[PDB]
Each structure stands twice: as C-alpha cells, then as structure tokens.
C-alpha cells in the first residue's frame, strides 16, 4: 500500500524479490543505484531483480479551488514548511532518544550494582543465622 | 516477548537458587539427626 | 536480569533512591544546509504572487485563460459530482479496516503471552516458597538439634 | 483405563506391587496368592499355594526377591518369588498371625503380630524366635523403625506401642486414637508413620531421635467401620505425598499430606476395599476390595 | 531500547524490593534467636 523509503503513497509501486517490501520506485531506484542492495534488510539487490506492481490507478480529487494561484502561492508553502517542521521535529525526537537512552543506561548500571550488593547481604545474614 | 525471555532465559536461575538452600538445609537436616540419634543414645547409658 | 514481575503484587522510593545513588556514582544533498538555513531562519520563500494581481496585461489575459481552465476543471469535477466522491469513500473504508485487524492480532499475541507468564510465575514462586519453608523448618529444628546436643552433652 | 481385575474365589484382603512394580500380588480368603502383570492388559500368570488360613498379610522384601506371608493358620511363611515355593514355615506362633514385617536393607529378620498376645521376632535362617514382647493382647499391625532397632505395633488398646529391640521394653506409647488400631505404614521418609483406625479418624506420627513427645501431627476424616469389623489398611505415597486408604463404604479415600483435603473419594467399587497399593514408580493404584475383585486406577 | 531498559529498571528495583525484606528479617532473626 505505502512505501518504506519516502513514507509515500505510490502511483508507481515496485517490490523486489530481494526484499519483499513495498517501496516507492523513486527512492528504490535512487537507493539500489547508490549501493546495490536493499535498504531495509540489505540482501544484495540489482535494480532488475525487482518487479513492478500493476496499480489500481488511485486518485485524489482536485479540490474546488485548484488552479495556478491555489497550487502555486498557497499550496506549495504548506507542503514545504510542513516538510521543514516535520523533519526538524523528527531530529528533535532523535535528540530526545539519545537523552533517554543515556538515562536508561544509567538506571541499568544502578539496578545491576545494587542487585549485586543486596543478593550478597541477604545470604550473608542468612549464613549468620545458619551458623 | 524478549522481556519475559530475558526473564525466561534466567528463569532457571530463579528456582535453582533456592533449590540449593532447600537441600543445603535437608543435607543439613542430615547433620541434625546424624547427631540427634547420637544425642538420644548418649543419654541412655549415663542415665544407666 | 533476575526479575519475575507477575509474582510480587507489591519501596519504590527506597529502591529508586539507592538506584539514583549508584547512578550518581556512575545525510542528504545540499538540501541539508539549504533546509537548515530555511528552517532556522524561519521565513517562507516569496511565493507565486504573479498570476494573481495584474506584464500586468499578460497577467490579466492569464487570469482569463486560467479561469477558462478553471471552468474546464469545473466541468471535469461536476462530471462526477457525488459519484467519484463515493468512489473514493467506499475504497477508503475498505482500506481502513485492515490496520485494526492487525491490532486485533497484536492484542491476541500479547495477552496470550501474559496468560503463559501467569501460570509460569505461579509454579515458580510456589516451589520457591516451599524452599523457603523447608529452610525455615530445617533452620529451626537445627537450632533445636544444637539444643539437643547441649542437653544430651551436659548429661 | 478402568482395568478392573478378577479371578478371586473370595474377598481380596492384601494387595501390593513388586518393589520394582513389575509383577503384582493380591490375595484374600482363597488361601492362595494371585499374581499378575501390572501393565499390558493386566495379565494373570502365577498363583502361590499352600497357606491354610486366609493369607492375612503379604509382604515383599524391598528389592523384590523374597516373599513373606502371615496366614491365620498359626504360621508365617517365606517364599521365593523366583519360584513361588516356600522357603520357611515360621511356626511357633500360638494363634492367628495377622501381620508380618521384614526389615528393609537390614539383616534378615521379621517382626510378626498375631492373635496370641505376643509380638514376635524371628530369623529367616534359624527357624528360631529372636524375641517376644508380651504386652497383654493380640497384635494386629507391626511396622519396624527405619534403623530396625524399634518395633511399632497396633493392637486392641488404642495405645500405639513401640519396643526397643535392645532394651526390650515399651519404648514409645502414644495415645489419642478413639478406638482400636488397624493399620500402620512407615513412609519413605523413614520417619513418619501412618495409622488408620475404624474410629473414623486416622493419624500420623514421627519416630525420630527427637519428636515433641506428643507427636500426633496430621489427622484425616472419612474412614468407616461397620458391623463387619474387617481389616483396615493404609499407605503413604512412594513420595510421602498422597494418603491412600480404603474403607467399608465402598469409597477409596485419597487425601494429601499438605492441605489434608479430599483429593478423591472414588466410587466404582461394589465391595469394601481392604487394601490400596501405590505403585513404586507410576501414578498407579490397585484397590483390593471385598467384592472379590480389584481395581487399577490411573491418576 | 528505552522499552526494554525501562522494564529492566522497574522489575530490577523490584529485585531489591524483595531482597531488602529478606535481609531485614534475616538480621532481625539473627539478633532474636
């Protein structure tokens, strides 16, 4: 249905026997030309190993105000500014990911050490009682 | 499914641990009655 | 690492406090910098405000032909009306339902995993509390063995 | 399955397994002893002969090679399971011998309870009596101690008794039974002893270098007596886990040591169950009943 | 990663929640008997 490279809804679907993963022909051409393998799993892929799919010709309806000024002055701004803000917020999400990963490695260090000490103290008092 | 597995990978170390002290106590219950009969028998012959 | 969740129904403050003590002891094209400028800068590129206003005679004749193309796209929109609208509606629902079928799959899988974990914990903790009980009994009766050794020994 | 066994001229009083659990012993009034294959189709091969009175107790060795049997006709008798033919006629017993108990993993010896008023020790080799503790009355049940240095007995005075083999006087007497003592059984712990009695109440004790001196630990409800006053016999599990009993209600009684709940009160029977045998390896039970047959339940 | 680490840290402080009870009763018994 959708594509795993641009996150796009294709009018040009092509999936490969090297990675059965619905990918957008544009980014699939670009990738397999960059390095001749799949991007997602990276089983070696040549661009002619894939096979296209025959699409149901999916269409979105031309809105009532569709013309030169609507598709030029207004429309491109929403798309470009929303790509800008979306990609920026996504990199921000990666920053938050690095922060939470560091905090989590800290918490794991704490758990491991405190457990190593208490597992001893317990059976230490237990051995003294078993004396 | 991996958090249960990280539990389930160490799952035997959860039971096998107390299975040591349980038998460390019954093998020490061996140490009890080994001399506990050495204790009842020891009275019988000084009382006689 | 050793952690059975399902067993203990029950602390957080003390365990996490000692934890925090241990923790205190512890790629695209030039578009990359273009979008860096355009996004940090924030401003929107000066748009296509040329065909609208009205050279200006060209833009007025352009408004003519363009609203002609607008009545053409209006022909090509009213040719359907509600028809190709419902054409997209029905297909939209028939594409919608599948993701929720998948969520049903995920619910079933995770909940049956938990259904296994429950009885697993129940067997494990049962045997382990039996071990604890055996330990209590042997420790008590072994201090009793020591008392018996003391008595039979003093004689 | 159900695996009900038959072929007995009369009521089946005594039943047990090979201490292997390879071949099966049952017997009762008929004055002979039927043996079977436990597995397969529960096949019935060999029958020991000779014992004049009703064979009041069969008793294996603990390996499974020799067979002791106390019969009401004033005699105990040793037999070779290898053959089925008698090794000794332990006579001298002045009246009805009820019970026999061969010592497990100790030297060759048997302690015998009977209807004379004596508890008697005898040797397999000498044809001679080793000791005899006259308390005053007929001795109905006898089980050793796991050191083979005390003799446990249940008789008509409700006062469960134990003799010192070396000091020869009444070593342990414990009381709390509401009526006569009918069945004794030493668990595989070597330590806990199990006792049934017609008084509807069955008891557990523990014979150790130290027990609290009042050692009535666990008590079970359900056993029945009637105007028949037939012999009542019980056992532990091979694991000391499930308490197995029969009774005169036609209900086989299966309890646990732990929660002492009714694990089963199983019907199926027509006769009063006179002995339950637990399998030394399997979850297999053979119920010897006075309906002149047996059952083999799988649990 | 944060999911696995979070389950780990929570159920891991639980290990101490149990160990502390055990050792605290243990030293108390050690004084008592």
UniProtKB/Swiss-Prot annotation, chain B:
Location in the cell: Nucleus; Nucleus speckle; Cytoplasm
Coiled coil: 12-48
Posttranslational modification: Phosphorylated on serine and threonine residues. Has no effect on subcellular location nor on homodimerization. Phosphorylated in vitro by CDK2. Phosphorylation enhances interaction with PPP1R8.
Domain of life: Eukaryota
Tissue-level expression: Ubiquitously expressed in both fetal and adult tissues.
Signal peptide per UniProt: none
Subunit relationships: Homodimer. Interacts with DAPK3. Component of the precatalytic, catalytic and postcatalytic spliceosome complexes. Part of a spliceosomal 'core' complex consisting of CDC5L, PLRG1, SPF27, CCAP1, CCAP3 and CCAP6. Interacts with PLRG1, Lodestar/TTF2, and NIPP1/PPP1R8. Component of the minor spliceosome, which splices U12-type introns. Within this complex, interacts with SCNM1. Component of the PRP19-CDC5L splicing complex composed of a core complex comprising a homotetramer of PRPF19, CDC5L, PLRG1 and BCAS2, and at least three less stably associated proteins CTNNBL1, CWC15 and HSPA8.
Family, per entry: Belongs to the CEF1 family.
Disease named in the record: A chromosomal aberration involving CDC5L is found in multicystic renal dysplasia. Translocation t(6;19)(p21;q13.1) with USF2.
Name the record gives this protein: Cell division cycle 5-like protein
Species of provenance: Homo sapiens
Gene giving rise to this polypeptide: CDC5L
UniProtKB/Swiss-Prot annotation, chain C:
Top-level taxon: Eukaryota
GO terms of biological process kind: alternative mRNA splicing, via spliceosome; mRNA splicing, via spliceosome; oocyte development; ovarian follicle development; protein catabolic process; RNA splicing; RNA splicing, via transesterification reactions; spindle assembly
Main location: nucleus
Tissue: Ubiquitously expressed.
Keyword terms: Acetylation, Coiled coil, mRNA processing, mRNA splicing, Nucleus, Phosphoprotein, Spliceosome
Subcellular location: Nucleus; Nucleus, Nucleolus
Family listed: Belongs to the SPF27 family.
Described function: Required for pre-mRNA splicing as component of the activated spliceosome. Component of the PRP19-CDC5L complex that forms an integral part of the spliceosome and is required for activating pre-mRNA splicing. May have a scaffolding role in the spliceosome assembly as it contacts all other components of the core complex. The PRP19-CDC5L complex may also play a role in the response to DNA damage (DDR).
Subunit structure: Component of the pre-catalytic and catalytic spliceosome complexes. Component of the postcatalytic spliceosome P complex. Component of the PRP19-CDC5L splicing complex composed of a core complex comprising a homotetramer of PRPF19, CDC5L, PLRG1 and BCAS2, and at least three less stably associated proteins CTNNBL1, CWC15 and HSPA8. Interacts directly in the complex with PRPF19, CDC5L and PLRG1.
Protein name stated in the entry: Pre-mRNA-splicing factor SPF27
From Swiss-Prot, chain D:
Coiled coil segments of this chain: none
A cellular component annotation (GO) from this entry: U2-type catalytic step 2 spliceosome
Sorted UniProt keywords: Isopeptide bond, Methylation, mRNA processing, mRNA splicing, Nucleus, Repeat, Spliceosome, Ubl conjugation, WD repeat
Compartments in which it is found: Nucleus
Main location: nucleus
WD repeats: 7-46, 50-89, 92-132, 134-173, 176-215, 226-265, 268-299
GO molecular function, one term: RNA binding
Entry superkingdom: Eukaryota
Keyword Ribonucleoprotein on entry: no
Location in chain, cross-link Glycyl lysine isopeptide (Lys-Gly) (interchain with G-Cter in SUMO2): 213
A GO BP annotation: RNA processing
Biological role: Required for pre-mRNA splicing as component of the activated spliceosome. Component of the U5 small nuclear ribonucleoprotein (snRNP) complex and the U4/U6-U5 tri-snRNP complex, building blocks of the spliceosome. As a component of the minor spliceosome, involved in the splicing of U12-type introns in pre-mRNAs.
Quaternary context: Component of the pre-catalytic and catalytic spliceosome complexes. Component of the postcatalytic spliceosome P complex. Part of the U5 snRNP complex. Interacts with PRPF8. Component of the U4/U6-U5 tri-snRNP complex composed of the U4, U6 and U5 snRNAs and at least PRPF3, PRPF4, PRPF6, PRPF8, PRPF31, SNRNP200, TXNL4A, WDR57, SNRNP40, DDX23, CD2BP2, PPIH, SNU13, EFTUD2, SART1 and USP39. Component of the minor spliceosome, which splices U12-type introns.
Protein's name in the database: U5 small nuclear ribonucleoprotein 40 kDa protein
Lineage: Eukaryota, Metazoa, Chordata, Craniata, Vertebrata
Range of the intact protein held here: 58 to 356 of 357
From Swiss-Prot, chain E:
Induction remarks: By gamma irradiation and chemical mutagens but not by UV irradiation.
Signal sequence segment: none
Compartments in which it is found: Nucleus; Nucleus, Nucleoplasm; Cytoplasm, Cytoskeleton, Spindle; Cytoplasm
Origin superkingdom: Eukaryota
Residue numbers carrying N6-acetyllysine: 21
Tissue expression: Ubiquitous. Weakly expressed in senescent cells of different tissue origins. Highly expressed in tumor cell lines.
Family: Belongs to the WD repeat PRP19 family.
Function: Ubiquitin-protein ligase which is a core component of several complexes mainly involved pre-mRNA splicing and DNA repair. Required for pre-mRNA splicing as component of the spliceosome. Core component of the PRP19C/Prp19 complex/NTC/Nineteen complex which is part of the spliceosome and participates in its assembly, its remodeling and is required for its activity. During assembly of the spliceosome, mediates 'Lys-63'-linked polyubiquitination of the U4 spliceosomal protein PRPF3.
Domain note: The 7 WD repeats are necessary and sufficient to support interaction with the RPA complex.
Name of the protein this chain belongs to: Pre-mRNA-processing factor 19
Organism for this UniProt entry: Homo sapiens
